[PDB]
Amino acid sequence: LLLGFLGAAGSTMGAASMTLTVQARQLLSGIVQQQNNLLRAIEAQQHLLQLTVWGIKQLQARILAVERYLKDKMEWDREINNYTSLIHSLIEESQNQQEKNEQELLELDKWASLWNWFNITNWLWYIKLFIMIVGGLVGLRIVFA
Amino acid sequence: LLLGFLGAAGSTMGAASMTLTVQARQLLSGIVQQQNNLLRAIEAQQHLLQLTVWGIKQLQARILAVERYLKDQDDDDKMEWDREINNYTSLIHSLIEESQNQQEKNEQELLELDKWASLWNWFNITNWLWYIKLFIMIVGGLVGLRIVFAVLSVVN
Amino acid sequence: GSTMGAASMTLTVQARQLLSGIVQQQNNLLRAIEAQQHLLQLTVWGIKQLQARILAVERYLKDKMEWDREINNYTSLIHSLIEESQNQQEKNEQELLELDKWASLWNWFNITNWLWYIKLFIMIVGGLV
Amino acid sequence: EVQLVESGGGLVQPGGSLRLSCAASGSISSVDVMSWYRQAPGKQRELVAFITDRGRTNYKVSVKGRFTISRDNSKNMVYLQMNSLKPEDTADYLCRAESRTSWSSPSPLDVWGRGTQVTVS
């Protein structure tokens, strides 16, 4: 009876759920893709940092050769190498976490799509049944009259 | 009673993940603002990197002038460095442009999420189920008339 | 059955963990940036020393206020942005704990099972009729 | 309605340990969430840790691995073991009873305590 009509109204509100849960997963994807852009930007900036350190070492070399021809630092090298190791470790960890997030989001989207098609088929079947019932009822009403 | 009989199909085609989303809207907003702040920090660090590279170039020019004027009473490892610098520079600029595009996309998608969240509320639901009621009534009447004509053709 | 059709949580839980992962990733990236910044500073310092050194050499041959300007401007900008991003990361992490509230076991699970059971009853009634 | 009372606070040297205790008036076996917050002068009220009615425990990022929340339903107690304390952990610590609406609770339960002070210096 009207239990099925309120059950048909609620089941049709599955488009209301599909509307908001899909755009959420869209934002989840763009967020992950954005982090991949920032991470690879940190990668290239780290490559750019290594080229600056080498240029400074080359400037230190030729300015010491010029000085010797006319005639603290080790700690600077130590700290440079320490922060370089820190950067490389953080880049490796960020890449691992990025792959984790990518695969997790992939599986989430796959199973969400399968569940959504499942719900769509269920809703279609039930609305078929309900509309056939009400049609049979109206038909028997007209046959009665 | 009847409210649960509606809410059954409602929240089964709805699920608790929608509640999770409407409660994590703010967390996702914070994540998006964090990404924007990190992108701005990356841009500023890129400007700093450019300034450091230019300072290295200037010190190189000065020391080359000094050593030339000294010898007036190392050369191949320079163009390659400049080429690699320019390559990674263009790479970073491209990545930052794409990151800005992606950030704007994410913010727009968040705004659309909130658009739909305001779309349903508590009362557009009632008008929409009213129109669903009208739809079911009309379609049922039509298929009922079809059944009636089938029975009439059987009788004829 | 509907009892075993309550594994939707395993996807919902997934979402939960995903957020955490993303959150952590944010933190990760921030750390990296911070480290780069320090490295940047180091390079900057070195450059100055080199410049200082070359000045000496150049003075040996005898007997700026804008590069430093933009250096300091962008350095203060990066420091303010790192402070803002650290505050935002604290806020995001705390908001995620205030979101790991409810569910992930027997509260939000039985609710899903009962709702699915009601949906099943309605569908059975419709088919029978 | 339950009432919460904090105890076990004080001051401790950086690297020491303490055991905070939230004594609830009523039985918290039916309380959905029991949470420990902290609030510092001039800062926000930070959620530190939380346990559930089923024992699901979670902590804050800066305190994971050195804070331990636990519950004794016989004594109606929520304990918070603090270890290797930093100066950043200095705050008035609160305990909160939370309970979303269920089948037995007509009204949502939201009860605060008066907090115990914890200083690490």
Numbering used by the authors:
A (entry chain B): 518 to 588, 627 to 700
B (entry chain C): 518 to 590, 624 to 706
C (entry chain A): 527 to 589, 628 to 693
D (entry chain D): 1 to 82, 82A, 82B, 82C, 83 to 100, 100A, 100B, 100C, ...
Question: Which passages does the manuscript contain on this structure?
Answer:
The HIV-1 envelope glycoprotein (Env) is a prototypic class I fusion protein that shares common pathways in membrane fusion with class II and III viral membrane fusion proteins. HIV-1 gp41 is composed of several functional segments that have been shown or suggested to extensively refold upon fusion activation: the N-terminal fusion peptide (FP), a fusion peptide proximal region (FPPR), the heptad repeat region 1 (HR1), a loop region followed by HR2, the membrane proximal external region (MPER), the transmembrane region (TMR), and a cytoplasmic domain.
Here, we present the crystal structure of gp41 locked in a fusion intermediate state by an MPER-specific neutralizing antibody. The six-helix bundle structure composed of three N-terminal and three C-terminal chains is conserved from HR1 residue A541 to HR2 residue L661 in all three protomers, and identical to previous structures. However, TMR and FP do not follow the three-fold symmetry and their chains point into different directions. In the third protomer, chain N-C has a helical FP linked by flexible residues G531 to A533 to a short helix of FPPR that bends at A541 with respect to helical HR1. Its corresponding chain C-C contains helical HR2 and a flexible region from N671 to N674, which stabilizes a ~ 45° rotation of the remaining MPER-TM helix that extends to residue R707.
